[PDB]
Amino acid sequence: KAKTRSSRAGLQFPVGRVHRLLRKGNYSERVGAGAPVYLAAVLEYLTAEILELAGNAARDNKKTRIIPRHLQLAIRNDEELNKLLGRVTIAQGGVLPNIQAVLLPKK
Amino acid sequence: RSRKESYSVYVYKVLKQVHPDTGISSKAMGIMNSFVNDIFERIAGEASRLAHYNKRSTITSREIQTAVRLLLPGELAKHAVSEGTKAVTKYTSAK
């Protein structure tokens, strides 16, 4: 008889848990029915985007297991994800290969 | 021996939809957890402020949507808003 709010909304992310985390979080006295649906969809979207581009980066290094290096490459190589995460450190991510042109040898 | 919740199960499902042959390390999963919790706090945070600014006791889809427009760059905002409206649509149309 019971169907998860997730399964109704068409989502892999837990609408029920998000609803509770909004309650136990002191964001507002009350929480509209949709707010946790929307929020859980937004978080699933952004997760898919990052796992998409990280998957690509994994495949490109002849690899089938995503690691932090693959997450850092996906994020820093995407103008929008890079801006969203500009003040964030991915542990074990390293940096993008970048040598300033003037530091290259002459011939 | 008490329950330590995470988004791991959900990140793993979305990984399988997007890259069915592709796995994910423990450290990578820790970063994805950090990610969700961070965007959760930023969006809830803006929503809370929006509601307080408009002397409202309630965070609805509308506060989440404005929060997303303020917090996500260009195309991420557009797509995120459309995934969010779509999920609320599908859910309102569910007997």
């Binding site: 979207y45 985007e49 | 979305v14 939809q17 997007v18 797509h79 995934e83």
Partner: peptide
């Protein structure tokens, strides 16, 4: 009909 990314790939079907 699941999640549509910017690259133009989806999340399968049902």
């Amino acid at each position: 009909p699941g999640a549509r990314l910017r690259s133009g790939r989806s999340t399968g079907a049902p």
